[PDB]
Amino acid sequence: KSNKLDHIGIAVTSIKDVLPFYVGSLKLKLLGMEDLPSQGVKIAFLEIGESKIELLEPLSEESPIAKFIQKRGEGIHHIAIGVKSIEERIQEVKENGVQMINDEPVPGARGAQVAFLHPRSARGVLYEFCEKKEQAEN
Amino acid sequence: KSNKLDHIGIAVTSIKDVLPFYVGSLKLKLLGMEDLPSQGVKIAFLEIGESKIELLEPLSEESPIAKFIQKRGEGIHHIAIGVKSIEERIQEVKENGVQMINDEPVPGARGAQVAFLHPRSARGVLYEFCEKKEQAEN
Ligand SMILES: [Zn+2]
Numbered sequence A, B: 001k002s003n004k005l006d007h008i009g010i011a012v013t014s015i016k017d018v019l020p021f022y023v024g025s026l027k028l029k030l031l032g033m034e035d036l037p038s039q040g041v042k043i044a045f046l047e048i049g050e051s052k053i054e055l056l057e058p059l060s061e062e063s064p065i066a067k068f069i070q071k072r073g074e075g076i077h078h079i080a081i082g083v084k085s086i087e088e089r090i091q092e093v094k095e096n097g098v099q100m101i102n103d104e105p106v107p108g109a110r111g112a113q114v115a116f117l118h119p120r121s122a123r124g125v126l127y128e129f130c131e132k133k134e135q136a137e138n
């Protein structure tokens, strides 16, 4: 409980080339964008209800996203679950037998602390735990 | 606007075999299940915030889900956007050049009227428009 659907990450070769579909056809609001050269990605955030769609564009051929697109093609990359305490959640899923890609949280989009669960624990789905500092008002 | 993230459909070979992960490790609440022999699927609904995760298990080898698992493996199948008027939304995206799998709504899970957009219009992502009758209270 308190689990939220934070976002869905979507691998694309070009944010610019899909914005006409997302903004023009689906009528989602583009919140903004960010560069994350440490993960080799540029990201665009689209609002969908209380969640977001995160469009992930590779910055170089060595980007994990470029590798994903090469092996699997463009499409849905991961589902992020917003959690209250990422350290405790990692410890709990590990105690229950889940294999992690990230045993310790790492920097993700929007200054969030993130950790990816191994798809082999989840029948081929890539889940991300996402802990964000609570910010609203003014 | 008024777009909601209704659910994420996830293809699995067995609902029973993944419930330990979803309920035990991720601590999502299992809402219930349904058989949809017309789409050749059994479905389990897990609550995640205001959205759901929809686990799709094929009922036979001829199921579109069985075919998907055969060609792509288990993993994320589609993202459903809840809309207020599905007829008008289909007409609008078509006018904007989106190719539909379903030009007319068809019966989906939970008695919803649904229509799938063609992944070739959306860079390999399968989107579903989902219109549900509004039900709460008592
Ligand atoms: Zn993410």
Ligand SMILES: [Zn+2]
Pocket (backbone or CB within 6 Å): B007, B009, B054, B078, B080, B108, B109, B128
């Ligand atoms: Zn669906």
